[PDB]
Paper text:
The annexin (Anx) family of Ca2+-binding proteins is widely distributed in eukaryotes, with twelve Anxs found in vertebrates. The Anxs are structurally distinct from the EF-hand and C2-domain Ca2+-binding proteins. AnxA11 has the longest N-terminal domain of all Anxs, with ~200 residues. Recent studies have revealed that mutations in AnxA11 play an important role in the development of the neurodegenerative disease amyotrophic lateral sclerosis (ALS).
The asymmetric unit contains three molecules of AnxA11, and the structure presents the canonical Anx core fold. As is typical for the Anxs, all Ca2+ binding sites are on one face of the molecule, promoting calcium-dependent lipid membrane binding. We show that a 4-residue sequence motif in the N terminus of the core structure, conserved in most Anxs, functions as a Velcro-like bridging segment and is important for the thermal stability of the Anx core structure. This segment, ~10 residues before the AnxA11 domain I helix A, is central in the folded structure, making interactions with the termini of several helices of the Anx fold, and effectively enabling a tight contact between the N terminus of domain I and the C terminus of domain IV. The 4-residue segment forms conserved interactions with the ends of helices in domain IV. Interestingly, three of these mutations involve a buried Arg residue, and a close look at the alignment reveals that these Arg residues are fully conserved in all rat Anxs.
Residue numbers in the entry: 189 to 502
The structure:
C-alpha cells in the first residue's frame, strides 16, 4: 500500500560510492542523490549510511547537511531518519521553542498504530531528557492534553470483533455526553474514541448516524472548538479512512499562495512505505486533480523533484 519499496539488486557500499561522487569536489550532483536515496527503502538507506561511514570514515548525514540547503535538504534528511526517529524529532520540533505545532502532534498521535507509538515512547526517552508524556504535558493543556496522553499510550483495543449491544450503548453515551445536553462531557468522548477498537468505533459511527441522523463529526464540531476539536476529528477521520485523512491534510498544506512545507514533507516521507498509494487514490477521488499534479504547481526545483520521486516511488 506504499509507494516506496525495497530496491532490487541492492548494494549499499556502491550506493555510498554514488553519493560520495555526487558530493566530492566542487559543486553538487543533486540529481544523483535523488535517484539513489529516493529509490531505496528506509532500511536500505540505513545500510547505505553504515557503508558510507565504513568506506570513507565520514558521516553521510553530516555531508548532505552541509552540501544541500533549503527544503530540498530537509526532505533528504527526513528520508534518512528511521520511521520512529523521524516521528520523534517531528514531535520535538513541534514543541520546541515558543508556541506549539498542534496539528503535527495530532497528525502523528491519531494515525500511528499501537506498536509504533510504544516505540515512539522508548525512542523519545532515549533521545531526549524527557519522556514523550512529559513533553506533551509541557506544551498542551485541558482536555486536549488528555487526548494526546491517551493516544500516546498505544493501548487502543486491538480486537476486531464487534458487539452491537456495546456499540449501541456507546452511541447512547456519546449522544448524552454532548448533543443531548447543555455543555459537553469531553472525557466521555476521550475514553470511547481512544480506548475502543477500530472495528467497534466504525460500527459506532454508523449506528450513531442511524439513530441521530447526524454524523459523529458534526456533533464534535458542534460540541467542541479549538485544538480539542481538530484532535477528535483527526482521530475519527483516521479510524474511518486514514488515507483520506492524510490526503486532506496534504491538500490543505498546498492550497493558498503559500505552502506548509513541514507538513508536506512529513506526510510524504512518513507514509511513503505505509499507505501513500491509498493517499494518492483518495486524493484523486476527493479533489479531482492528482496529488502528483498539485505538487508540481506548489513546489519547484530539486525540492519538487524528490517529492514527486516519493509520490511515484519505484
Ligand atoms: Ca561538493
Ligand atoms: Ca451540547
Ligand atoms: Ca465548534
Amino acid at each position: 500500500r506504499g509507494t516506496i519499496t525495497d530496491a532490487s539488486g541492492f548494494d549499499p557500499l556502491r550506493d555510498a560510492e554514488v553519493l560520495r561522487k555526487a558530493m566530492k569536489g566542487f559543486g553538487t550532483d543533486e540529481q544523483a542523490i535523488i535517484d539513489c536515496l529516493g529509490s531505496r527503502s528506509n532500511k536500505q538507506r540505513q545500510q547505505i549510511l553504515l557503508s558510507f561511514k565504513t568506506a570513507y570514515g565520514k558521516d553521510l548525514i553530516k555531508d548532505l547537511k552541509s552540501e544541500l540547503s533549503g527544503n530540498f535538504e530537509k526532505t533528504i534528511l527526513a528520508l534518512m531518519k528511521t520511521p520512529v526517529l523521524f516521528d520523534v524529532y517531528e514531535i520535538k520540533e513541534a514543541i520546541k521553542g515558543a508556541g506549539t505545532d498542534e496539528a503535527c502532534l495530532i497528525e502523528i498521535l491519531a494515525s500511528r498504530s499501537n506498536e509504533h507509538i510504544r516505540e515512539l515512547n522508548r525512542a523519545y526517552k532515549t533521545e531526549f531528557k524527557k519522556t514523550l508524556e512529559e513533553a506533551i504535558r509541557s506544551d498542551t493543556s485541558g482536555h486536549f492534553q488528555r487526548l494526546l496522553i491517551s493516544l500516546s499510550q498505544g493501548n487502543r483495543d486491538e480486537s476486531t470483533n464487534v458487539d452491537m449491544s456495546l456499540v449501541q450503548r456507546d452511541v447512547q453515551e456519546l449522544y448524552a455526553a454532548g448533543e443531548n445536553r447543555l455543555g459537553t462531557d469531553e472525557s466521555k468522548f476521550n475514553a470511547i474514541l481512544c480506548s475502543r477498537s477500530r472495528a467497534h468505533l466504525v460500527a459506532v459511527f454508523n449506528e450513531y448516524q442511524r439513530m441521530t441522523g447526524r454524523d459523529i463529526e458534526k456533533s464534535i464540531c458542534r460540541e467542541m472548538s479549538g485544538d480539542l476539536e481538530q484532535g477528535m476529528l483527526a482521530v475519527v477521520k483516521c479510524l474511518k479512512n486514514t488515507p483520506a485523512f492524510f490526503a486532506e491534510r496534504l491538500n490543505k498544506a498546498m492550497r493558498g499562495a503559500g505552502t506548509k512545507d513541514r507538513t508536506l514533507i512529513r506526510i510524504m516521507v512518513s507514509r511513503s512505505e505505509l499507505d501513500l498509494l491509498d493517499i494518492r487514490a483518495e486524493y484523486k477521488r476527493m479533489y479531482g486533480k492528482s496529488l502528483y499534479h498539485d505538487i508540481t504547481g506548489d513546489t519547484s526545483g530539486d525540492y519538487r523533484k524528490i517529492l514527486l520521486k516519493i509520490c511515484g516511488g519505484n
